[PDB]
Design a protein around this nucleic acid. Sequence first.
RNA 1: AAAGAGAGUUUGAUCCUGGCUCAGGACGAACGCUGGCGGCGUGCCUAAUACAUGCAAGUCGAACGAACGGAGGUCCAAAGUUAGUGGCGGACGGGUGAGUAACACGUGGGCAACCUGCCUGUAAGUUGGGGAUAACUCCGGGAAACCGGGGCUAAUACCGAAUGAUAGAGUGUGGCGCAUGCCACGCUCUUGAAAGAUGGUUUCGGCUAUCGCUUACAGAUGGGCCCGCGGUGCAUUAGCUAGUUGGUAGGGUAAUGGCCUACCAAGGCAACGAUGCAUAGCCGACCUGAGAGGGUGAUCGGCCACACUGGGACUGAGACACGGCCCAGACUCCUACGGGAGGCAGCAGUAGGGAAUCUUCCGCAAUGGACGAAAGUCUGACGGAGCAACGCCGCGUGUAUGAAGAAGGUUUUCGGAUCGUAAAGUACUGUUGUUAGAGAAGAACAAGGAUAAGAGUAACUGCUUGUCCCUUGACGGUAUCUAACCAGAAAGCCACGGCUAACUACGUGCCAGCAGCCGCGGUAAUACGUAGGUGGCAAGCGUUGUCCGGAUUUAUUGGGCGUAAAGCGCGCGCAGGCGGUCUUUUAAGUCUGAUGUGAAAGCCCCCGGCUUAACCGGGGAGGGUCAUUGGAAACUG
Lengths: 87, 81
Amino acid sequence: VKIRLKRMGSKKKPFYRIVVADSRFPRDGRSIETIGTYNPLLDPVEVKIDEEATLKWMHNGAKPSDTVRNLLSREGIMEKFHNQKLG
Amino acid sequence: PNIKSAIKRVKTAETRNSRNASQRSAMRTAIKKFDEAAANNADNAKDLYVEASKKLDSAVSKGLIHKNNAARNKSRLAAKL
RNA sequence: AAAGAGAGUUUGAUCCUGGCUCAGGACGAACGCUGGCGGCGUGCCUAAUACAUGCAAGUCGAACGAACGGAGGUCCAAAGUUAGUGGCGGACGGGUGAGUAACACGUGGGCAACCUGCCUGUAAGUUGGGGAUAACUCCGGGAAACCGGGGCUAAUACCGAAUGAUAGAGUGUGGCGCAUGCCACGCUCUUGAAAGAUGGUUUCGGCUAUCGCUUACAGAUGGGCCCGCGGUGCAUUAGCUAGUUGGUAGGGUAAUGGCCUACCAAGGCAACGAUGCAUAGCCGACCUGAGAGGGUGAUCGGCCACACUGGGACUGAGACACGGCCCAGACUCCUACGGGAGGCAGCAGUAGGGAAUCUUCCGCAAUGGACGAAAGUCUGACGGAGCAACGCCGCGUGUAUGAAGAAGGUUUUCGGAUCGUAAAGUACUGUUGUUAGAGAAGAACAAGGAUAAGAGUAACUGCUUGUCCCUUGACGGUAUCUAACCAGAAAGCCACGGCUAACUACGUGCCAGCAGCCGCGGUAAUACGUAGGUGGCAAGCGUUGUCCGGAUUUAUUGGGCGUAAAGCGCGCGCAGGCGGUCUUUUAAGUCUGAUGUGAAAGCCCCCGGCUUAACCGGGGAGGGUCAUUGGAAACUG
Ligand SMILES: [Mg+2]
Ligand SMILES: [Mg+2]
Ligand SMILES: [Mg+2]
Ligand SMILES: [Mg+2]
Ligand SMILES: [Mg+2]
Ligand SMILES: [Mg+2]
Ligand SMILES: [Mg+2]
Ligand SMILES: [Mg+2]
Ligand SMILES: [Mg+2]
Ligand SMILES: [Mg+2]
Ligand SMILES: [Mg+2]
Ligand SMILES: [Mg+2]
Ligand SMILES: [Mg+2]
Ligand SMILES: [Mg+2]
Ligand SMILES: [Mg+2]
Ligand SMILES: [Mg+2]
Ligand SMILES: [Mg+2]
Ligand SMILES: [Mg+2]
Ligand SMILES: [Mg+2]
Ligand SMILES: [Mg+2]
Ligand SMILES: [Mg+2]
Ligand SMILES: [Mg+2]
Ligand SMILES: [Mg+2]
Ligand SMILES: [Mg+2]
Ligand SMILES: [Mg+2]
Ligand SMILES: [Mg+2]
Ligand SMILES: [Mg+2]
Ligand SMILES: [Mg+2]
Ligand SMILES: [Mg+2]
Ligand SMILES: [Mg+2]
Ligand SMILES: [Mg+2]
Ligand SMILES: [Mg+2]
Ligand SMILES: [Mg+2]
Ligand SMILES: [Mg+2]
Ligand SMILES: [Mg+2]
Ligand SMILES: [Mg+2]
Ligand SMILES: [Mg+2]
Ligand SMILES: [Mg+2]
Ligand SMILES: [Mg+2]
Ligand SMILES: [Mg+2]
Ligand SMILES: [Mg+2]
Ligand SMILES: [Mg+2]
Ligand SMILES: [Mg+2]
Ligand SMILES: [Mg+2]
Ligand SMILES: [Mg+2]
Ligand SMILES: [Mg+2]
Ligand SMILES: [Mg+2]
Ligand SMILES: [Mg+2]
Ligand SMILES: [Mg+2]
Ligand SMILES: [Mg+2]
Ligand SMILES: [Mg+2]
Ligand SMILES: [Mg+2]
Ligand SMILES: [Mg+2]
Ligand SMILES: [Mg+2]
Ligand SMILES: [Mg+2]
Ligand SMILES: [Mg+2]
Ligand SMILES: [Mg+2]
Ligand SMILES: [Mg+2]
Ligand SMILES: [Mg+2]
Ligand SMILES: [Mg+2]
Ligand SMILES: [Mg+2]
Ligand SMILES: [Mg+2]
Ligand SMILES: [Mg+2]
Ligand SMILES: [Mg+2]
Ligand SMILES: [Mg+2]
Ligand SMILES: [Mg+2]
Ligand SMILES: [Mg+2]
Ligand SMILES: [Mg+2]
Ligand SMILES: [Mg+2]
Ligand SMILES: [Mg+2]
Ligand SMILES: [Mg+2]
Ligand SMILES: [Mg+2]
Ligand SMILES: [Mg+2]
Ligand SMILES: [Mg+2]
Ligand SMILES: [Mg+2]
Ligand SMILES: [Mg+2]
Ligand SMILES: [Mg+2]
Ligand SMILES: [Mg+2]
Ligand SMILES: [Mg+2]
Ligand SMILES: [Mg+2]
Ligand SMILES: [Mg+2]
Ligand SMILES: [Mg+2]
Ligand SMILES: [Mg+2]
Ligand SMILES: [Mg+2]
Ligand SMILES: [Mg+2]
Ligand SMILES: [Mg+2]
Ligand SMILES: [Mg+2]
Ligand SMILES: [Mg+2]
């Protein structure tokens, strides 16, 4: 179980969905529950995320990827997760 | 085979096959002796029974039998006495 | 809010009935003529026919085998950065649609009848022994795949022991349910575990950090089994079945179950279509249609089955396993004739079949996988480039002016009309194009160094979070932009009697021929061939094949049976369909509210992003005789 990044859009124009799914499934195939969007083309990155289901999945054992970890850090999910673990 | 991993896997397959067959045969022979003793007269039987259960329990620790299988066999052959 | 077009054809003329044909839309399409560009997509529908060539699954030295500088002895050299056994992965990812009419799929449930490596959290423990074995080295069989024997050695390799069960039995208490039974706790006895590796500190003993290993309990995830309903042709296919139907005991599996065995009884399914034959993967969905319906399963997403044909098992948490193993069968290849090797329905590519379908290319930069503590390796997944007007969308081949009207074709009632403001001339632009230059996003990182704060500790090392420093592009000098030159380098196809938009002349003479139909051709042809003209579309235009519409031509929506096709020759009647009046009661049908669900993508509505569009993104809506449950009682029951 990983909160993954699914790619779609068009040729040379990618758009990404922050989604949780199993590591044995295809990248664009079956998934569990989408939570956010990620657009790389714009110079200021526009990332929307639930920030509530994400924490539940992190509590339940959903390890993210490198860029998903970076996004959760910038949006404050990782720091709040650390605070919840301490508290 | 034509993959470097397949040859190692098949060699490990024969090794594990020999080992598991040996332990499984030993456990079946212990069970057979116990049920032979239990079916006819009393004699030790119960004295055998203990180690028969042992042959099952350790087997679960080896990985060649399921825990539910061991519990089911132990309960089923415990009804003979 | 939605809401449906007809025409020709039986007759000397009519009106009905009825069939046939045409006018529209859509392809994974094919063929003919033709052909400028850009963006986004698609491309063996036939032989699940046979396969050259290369690449597609490997990785860990933190568990046991390297060159150099270089201790030491003008010569050789000790220690310091690189095969295999073992662990994990190969069951993912990728490809085909053969088989299958069935719990395979869709939808909705049940499991008090189940399993689950890795991932997360918690509670305990990682205490002591043994015997080996590859690798390596000798002896042989060897044509070669490779076989045996002798000796030697490690481990996170293997096997006992100490101790630890919510595992088996025996019991008790309490609370409970959907019959079998579930939950909390207590008592006695019998069994079942481990492995260490990289550092820190300390005294060095110890202690400690990270990754590890054993047992138990939850979460998450992925699977297993059972069930109600739903989706095809034939009755010129009427009986089928015997482990079949049920029970009593037993075996087996993770689990229930004739799943299997012995015994007992003769059952079970079927006109609400059993059994059999034929065809076919299923769905979200696609085409058409006013809608109801009809046809199909191309691309993409989910489930299922298969891997040359047939059978079987091992290892493993998970396989009866595309690139794993054994046997038989057909085919290809090597042989010293004893015997061996192989499976493109993986990515490219070859032969054959076809009316018909592509490069034997680049890269792990991005996303995601497997291994590892990390750097890192692999990844024909994937990100990209090449070919084909195969489809959708977008742009161009110039623009304004230029006359009773250049010149020349076509006709002429030979005065003229027509091509036609169309030309030349005139003034202008460069979307394309040529030449020369500037030239992005896609990049987040990971790791490495400092930091600041936490938990842990006797202290550290390390760990978690936060802030900075440095590094990374196949596409690719690609999109894009800037300047100079140029009307120059860029238009074709079908049709013209009616259906249906658009006519003149010549040639031919029931010949040549045209044709979807009415039908044209025998000397004055708007239908045959050509020329001029005109109409439609446009880098496309025509022809063919398949589906829907028109077709109310299977009529529930939406037809009929006196004479056009259509009432059995008549009766008695089983099953089935329907049923006079009133009252009380039930909620099966009926109507309605709430909960859960009907994935994503697709149609539709509103917003946006690409110079517009195609295209892409966000939100919303739609779709069920669906399960739980609360309501009303007019109507059918
Ligand atoms: Mg990443
Ligand atoms: Mg033991
Ligand atoms: Mg088990
Ligand atoms: Mg017609
Ligand atoms: Mg063509
Ligand atoms: Mg041409
Ligand atoms: Mg184009
Ligand atoms: Mg095919
Ligand atoms: Mg090695
Ligand atoms: Mg698959
Ligand atoms: Mg299919
Ligand atoms: Mg030892
Ligand atoms: Mg030894
Ligand atoms: Mg030794
Ligand atoms: Mg004990
Ligand atoms: Mg106890
Ligand atoms: Mg219950
Ligand atoms: Mg107790
Ligand atoms: Mg023991
Ligand atoms: Mg670690
Ligand atoms: Mg380790
Ligand atoms: Mg359907
Ligand atoms: Mg269908
Ligand atoms: Mg039974
Ligand atoms: Mg078929
Ligand atoms: Mg389409
Ligand atoms: Mg219609
Ligand atoms: Mg289709
Ligand atoms: Mg296909
Ligand atoms: Mg599909
Ligand atoms: Mg195959
Ligand atoms: Mg084949
Ligand atoms: Mg096994
Ligand atoms: Mg495989
Ligand atoms: Mg293959
Ligand atoms: Mg291929
Ligand atoms: Mg060919
Ligand atoms: Mg990569
Ligand atoms: Mg990666
Ligand atoms: Mg490789
Ligand atoms: Mg590909
Ligand atoms: Mg590609
Ligand atoms: Mg083509
Ligand atoms: Mg095109
Ligand atoms: Mg166009
Ligand atoms: Mg021109
Ligand atoms: Mg001009
Ligand atoms: Mg002009
Ligand atoms: Mg003339
Ligand atoms: Mg002009
Ligand atoms: Mg120049
Ligand atoms: Mg330059
Ligand atoms: Mg240039
Ligand atoms: Mg830190
Ligand atoms: Mg930091
Ligand atoms: Mg910076
Ligand atoms: Mg720096
Ligand atoms: Mg650097
Ligand atoms: Mg990188
Ligand atoms: Mg390059
Ligand atoms: Mg270049
Ligand atoms: Mg350019
Ligand atoms: Mg110039
Ligand atoms: Mg010039
Ligand atoms: Mg030019
Ligand atoms: Mg010019
Ligand atoms: Mg010009
Ligand atoms: Mg042209
Ligand atoms: Mg003509
Ligand atoms: Mg003409
Ligand atoms: Mg024209
Ligand atoms: Mg109809
Ligand atoms: Mg009629
Ligand atoms: Mg009548
Ligand atoms: Mg009649
Ligand atoms: Mg009559
Ligand atoms: Mg009659
Ligand atoms: Mg009658
Ligand atoms: Mg009746
Ligand atoms: Mg009545
Ligand atoms: Mg949907
Ligand atoms: Mg899709
Ligand atoms: Mg716009
Ligand atoms: Mg769209
Ligand atoms: Mg959308
Ligand atoms: Mg949407
Ligand atoms: Mg809607
Ligand atoms: Mg009443």
